[PDB]
Each structure stands twice: as structure tokens, then as C-alpha cells.
Design a protein around this ligand. Sequence first.
Ligand SMILES: Cc1cc2nc3c(=O)[nH]c(=O)nc-3n(C[C@H](O)[C@H](O)[C@H](O)COP(=O)(O)O)c2cc1C
Length: 138
Amino acid sequence: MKIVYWSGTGNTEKMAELIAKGIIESGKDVNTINVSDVNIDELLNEDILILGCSAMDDEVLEESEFEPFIEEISTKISGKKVALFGSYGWGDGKWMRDFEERMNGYGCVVVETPLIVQNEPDEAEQDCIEFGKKIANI
Ligand SMILES: Cc1cc2nc3c(=O)[nH]c(=O)nc-3n(C[C@H](O)[C@H](O)[C@H](O)COP(=O)(O)O)c2cc1C
């Protein structure tokens, strides 16, 4: 499987690493890829797309790299399974509710409840690992 993410200070990156750890612990292989290094064509062959991005202002996806990526793949992912995650700061998850609505709008099947964590995982570490285990059970 593959995990694609954008992280500005490392919070979401840390989540990505933990989610990957859960998938691997379940006996499966997974590669984490920063959005700047992703190859679209290779990503489109995946069964499940695991995507992550922190909340930028105001309650939107990161604009310079992550959103353009989402826009680019939007017309090629109908029927695909996706799992969403991200770290946020002061909000209540509005950016994620919108991210989930958007992916469903493109015809994607959002397989699990999106995982959101405030700031760095730390206390939510096991939660991240378990989220990965849930995805490996799909
Ligand atoms: C310019 C900017 C705008 C932000 N806007 C929001 C926001 O609208 N809602 C929110 O909850 N957090 C907001 N945050 C906080 C980040 O989502 C939060 O610090 C998160 O932990 C960053 O994770 P990352 O290191 O993976 O980027 C913003 C951060 C930055 C730098």
C-alpha cells in the first residue's frame, strides 16, 4: 500500500509513520511518500489510497502542493478506496469534514472514519498505529 502526505512541521509526517507501522505490524508492506515525491501513475494502481494533510487556513488543505495533487487525481479515482488523516491545531476538524465530503464527491469510498489528531501525535500514538491496523483489515 502507499501513504501520501504533506506536513509543514512534522506532525502529519509522524502520523504517517505510525499508520505505516500498524500496517506493517499486520503483516503487510507499505511505503510512505511525501506529496512532492509522488508519481501519480503509480499511485493510481493502488487498491487503497491513504492520504494525509494538516489543516491550513482557513480549515483548508495545504494550497501549494497538496491541493493541486488532489485536483490532479480527482478525475481518475472514482470507485477507489481512500483513508484520510491529518493533524490540526485550534479548529474542530472542519478541514477534514470537507476533505471527506470532497473525496466522496469524486466517487471515492472513504473506508474508515478520518483520523485527526491535535498537534504532535505523542499521546495519540497507539491511535495512529490502530488506524493503520484497521486499514490493513480492509
Ligand atoms: C498558516 C497555518 C494555518 C493554519 N490553519 C489552521 C486552521 O485553520 N485550523 C487548525 O485547526 N489548525 C490550523 N493550523 C495549525 C496546523 O494545522 C497544526 O499546527 C498541525 O499540527 C500542523 O501539522 P503539520 O506539521 O503536519 O503541518 C495552521 C497552521 C499554519 C502554519
